[PDB]
Design an enzyme around this catalytic site. Structure first.
Site, PDB file in Angstrom:
ATOM      1  NE  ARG A 199      13.358  17.323   0.480  1.00 52.88           N
ATOM      2  CZ  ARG A 199      14.662  17.605   0.261  1.00 52.88           C
ATOM      3  NH1 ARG A 199      15.114  17.406  -0.964  1.00 52.88           N
ATOM      4  NH2 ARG A 199      15.233  18.148   1.246  1.00 52.88           N
TER       5      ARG A 199
ATOM      6  NE  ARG B  66      -2.041   0.860   3.726  1.00 55.44           N
ATOM      7  CZ  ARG B  66      -1.560   1.787   4.592  1.00 55.44           C
ATOM      8  NH1 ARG B  66      -1.473   3.107   3.926  1.00 55.44           N
ATOM      9  NH2 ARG B  66      -1.190   1.508   5.909  1.00 55.44           N
TER      10      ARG B  66
ATOM     11  CE  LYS C  26       6.170   7.019   4.788  1.00 54.80           C
ATOM     12  NZ  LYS C  26       6.018   5.633   4.418  1.00 54.80           N
ATOM     13  N   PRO C  27       6.473  12.827   5.681  1.00 50.04           N
ATOM     14  CG  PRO C  27       7.786  13.345   7.474  1.00 50.04           C
ATOM     15  CD  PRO C  27       6.764  12.421   7.106  1.00 50.04           C
TER      16      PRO C  27
ATOM     17  CG  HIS D 227      11.566  -1.013   6.137  1.00 54.82           C
ATOM     18  ND1 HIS D 227      11.359   0.581   6.594  1.00 54.82           N
ATOM     19  CD2 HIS D 227      13.142  -0.660   5.905  1.00 54.82           C
ATOM     20  CE1 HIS D 227      12.536   1.085   6.656  1.00 54.82           C
ATOM     21  NE2 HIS D 227      13.481   0.381   6.317  1.00 54.82           N
ATOM     22  CG  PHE D 228      11.266   1.889  -0.019  1.00 52.55           C
ATOM     23  CD1 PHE D 228      11.219   1.203  -1.231  1.00 52.55           C
ATOM     24  CD2 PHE D 228      12.323   3.011   0.018  1.00 52.55           C
ATOM     25  CE1 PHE D 228      11.970   1.480  -2.323  1.00 52.55           C
ATOM     26  CE2 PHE D 228      13.048   3.145  -1.168  1.00 52.55           C
ATOM     27  CZ  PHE D 228      12.918   2.656  -2.161  1.00 52.55           C
ATOM     28  CG  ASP D 229      16.620   0.697   4.980  1.00 55.30           C
ATOM     29  OD1 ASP D 229      16.017   1.288   5.851  1.00 55.30           O
ATOM     30  OD2 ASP D 229      17.983   0.590   5.001  1.00 55.30           O
TER      31      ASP D 229
ATOM     32  CG  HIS E 166       6.925   1.583   0.100  1.00 55.96           C
ATOM     33  ND1 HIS E 166       7.425   2.929   0.143  1.00 55.96           N
ATOM     34  CD2 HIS E 166       6.992   1.196   1.457  1.00 55.96           C
ATOM     35  CE1 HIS E 166       7.572   3.138   1.499  1.00 55.96           C
ATOM     36  NE2 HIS E 166       7.416   2.349   2.327  1.00 55.96           N
TER      37      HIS E 166
ATOM     38  CB  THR F   9      10.463   5.618  -2.583  1.00 58.51           C
ATOM     39  OG1 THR F   9      11.415   6.501  -1.860  1.00 58.51           O
ATOM     40  CG2 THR F   9      10.641   4.917  -3.722  1.00 58.51           C
TER      41      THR F   9
ATOM     42  CE  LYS G 191      18.724   5.234   4.017  1.00 58.61           C
ATOM     43  NZ  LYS G 191      17.676   6.217   3.819  1.00 58.61           N
TER      44      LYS G 191
END
Ligand code: RU
Length: 124
Positions: free
Chosen positions: A85, A10, A41-42, A119-121, A12, A45, A66
């Site tokens: 962004r 959902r 959300k800051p 998770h998208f790192d 990414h 991607t 990370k």
């Protein structure tokens, strides 16, 4: 309940478009994917590749996450992606974003059985 795998999809996955469609792509997507519900959300991607291709990354290049964890993987091939962004003028609930298309290697964190992206790192 939404699983971690489903949430990743959902937040990414966007296989429908081949690249950042319009300059307002992020403004529409961040909202439609519910990423501006409780706040703006800051950064986020979206990946424009098949689900199978993205899921396959979990068996590709193992790299450090990370956060220091070891369950991150980098795609061997570059992938079509769109980075979103938040603009400086953006003010909740009218979240505004800058849409940027790119072709880079993605790095995702994988977990579970099946071992899938959760998770998208980063993108490199
Ligand atoms: Ru490369």
């Amino acid at each position: 309940k939404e699983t971690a795998a489903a949430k990743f999809e959902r937040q990414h996955m966007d296989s429908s478009t081949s690249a950042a469609s319009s300059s307002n792509y992020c403004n529409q997507m961040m909202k439609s994917r519910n990423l501006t519900k409780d706040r703006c959300k800051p950064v986020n991607t979206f990946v424009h590749e098949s689900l199978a291709d993205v899921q396959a990354v979990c068996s590709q290049k193992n790299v450090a996450c990370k956060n220091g964890q070891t369950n991150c993987y980098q795609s061997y091939s570059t992938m079509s992606i769109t980075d979103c962004r938040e603009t400086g003028s953006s003010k909740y609930p009218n979240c505004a974003y800058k849409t940027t298309q790119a072709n880079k290697h993605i790095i995702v964190a994988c977990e579970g059985n099946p071992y899938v992206p959760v998770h998208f790192d980063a993108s490199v």
